[PDB]
Amino acid sequence: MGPFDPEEMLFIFTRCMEDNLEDGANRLPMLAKWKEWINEPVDSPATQCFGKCVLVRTGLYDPVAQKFDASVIQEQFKAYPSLGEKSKVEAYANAVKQLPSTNNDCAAVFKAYDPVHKAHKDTSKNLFHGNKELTKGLYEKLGKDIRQKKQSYFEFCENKYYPAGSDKRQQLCQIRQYTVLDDALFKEHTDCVMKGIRYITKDNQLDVEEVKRDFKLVNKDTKALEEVLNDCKSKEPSNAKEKSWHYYKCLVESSVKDDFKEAFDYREVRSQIYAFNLPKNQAYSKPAVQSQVMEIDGKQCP
Numbered sequence: 001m002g003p004f005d006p007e008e009m010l011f012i013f014t015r016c017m018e019d020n021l022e023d024g025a026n027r028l029p030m031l032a033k034w035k036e037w038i039n040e041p042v043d044s045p046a047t048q049c050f051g052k053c054v055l056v057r058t059g060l061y062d063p064v065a066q067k068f069d070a071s072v073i074q075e076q077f078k079a080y081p082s083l084g085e086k087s088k089v090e091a092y093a094n095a096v097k098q099l100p101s102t103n104n105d106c107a108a109v110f111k112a113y114d115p116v117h118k119a120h121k122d123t124s125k126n127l128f129h130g131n132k133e134l135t136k137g138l139y140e141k142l143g144k145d146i147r148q149k150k151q152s153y154f155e156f157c158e159n160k161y162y163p164a165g166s167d168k169r170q171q172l173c174q175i176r177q178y179t180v181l182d183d184a185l186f187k188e189h190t191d192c193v194m195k196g197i198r199y200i201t202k203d204n205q206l207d208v209e210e211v212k213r214d215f216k217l218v219n220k221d222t223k224a225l226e227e228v229l230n231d232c233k234s235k236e237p238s239n240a241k242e243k244s245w246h247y248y249k250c251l252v253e254s255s256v257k258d259d260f261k262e263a264f265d266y267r268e269v270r271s272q273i274y275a276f277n278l279p280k281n282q283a284y285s286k287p288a289v290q291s292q293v294m295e296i297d298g299k300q301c302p
């Protein structure tokens with residue numbers, strides 16, 4: 001599933017923190033440390049599960065094989081030669097290669113990896129887009145071609161496919177009101193969005209749990225959603241290019257369309273700042289998101 005670009009690593013780090021940070025007194029202290037690649041407190045289940053989360057999402061720990069996988073490191077270095085020195089990347093990969101088979105529980109995985117993390121902190125940090133200076137440089141080089149920090153993922157895709165100043169821009173008026181278009185350009189755009197919020201995997205597969213995650217975040221039950229998605233999947237088209245559009249269309253035209261639009265609107269807001277829930281997990285309120293999304297509507301469709 002690697003190599004990973006800066007946005008992909010940002011998604012992984014922030015999602016893992018969102019799912020693993022304690023609530024209450026220790027949250028802010030923990031966050032401050034984890035952000036700096038200080039995986040402490042080492043004795044905390046939250047730190048241990050955070051560590052496991054990152055390792056699993058990157059592929060550095062394979063819970064099926066119950067083994068660490070150093071090939072992720074070499075793939076990352078191959079994609080980003082500027083982010084490592086060969087000898088040091090090799091030393092890091094070697095340390096991972098020589099880790100023993102490890103059980104798939106947070107404590108076991110964290111304990112096995114922690115010595116490697118400490119012995120190869122800078123090497124791993126640089127390679128996996130944790131170096132602020134190096135990452136800033138990559139974002140600047142990439143510019144409009146990658147989702148930027150503090151930019152809505154929806155905005156990123158919209159600008160890519162319906163650029164400002166172009167004769168295409170006007171289509172955003174309908175698009176942002178959940179009008180399902182039929183053309184190649186819209187299918188490409190919808191692919192960009194659906195993959196960007198992880199409803200569709202890099203591997204072009206539906207991720208029902210990600211859709212469910214967003215429903216739960218707007219306080220909706222997911223039984224109907226699962227039934228809808230099950231029906232949608234039995235109608236999945238052969239053309240891989242069309243898959244994201246297929247599920248978007250199916251959801252928008254379905255018996256859960258209102259809940260879907262509510263969940264998708266909130267996701268848009270949260271996609272604008274990946275650390276949305278990190279300092280404190282924010283309670284959801286429908287009217288506040290209503291306001292924000294309407295403001296974005298008037299920005300993209302003036």
Ligand SMILES: NC[C@@H](O)c1ccc(O)c(O)c1
Pocket residue numbers: 154158175176177178189190193264265268293
């Ligand atoms: N809130 C934005 C939402 O209406 C939307 C849905 C689908 C899109 O392809 C899009 O750009 C925006």
Ligand SMILES: [Br-]
Pocket residue numbers: 026029030040041
């Ligand atoms: Br702490």
Ligand SMILES: [Br-]
Pocket residue numbers: 079080081082083
């Ligand atoms: Br590079």
Ligand SMILES: [Br-]
Pocket residue numbers: 148149150151272273274275
């Ligand atoms: Br961000």
Ligand SMILES: [Br-]
Pocket residue numbers: 031275278279
């Ligand atoms: Br933060």
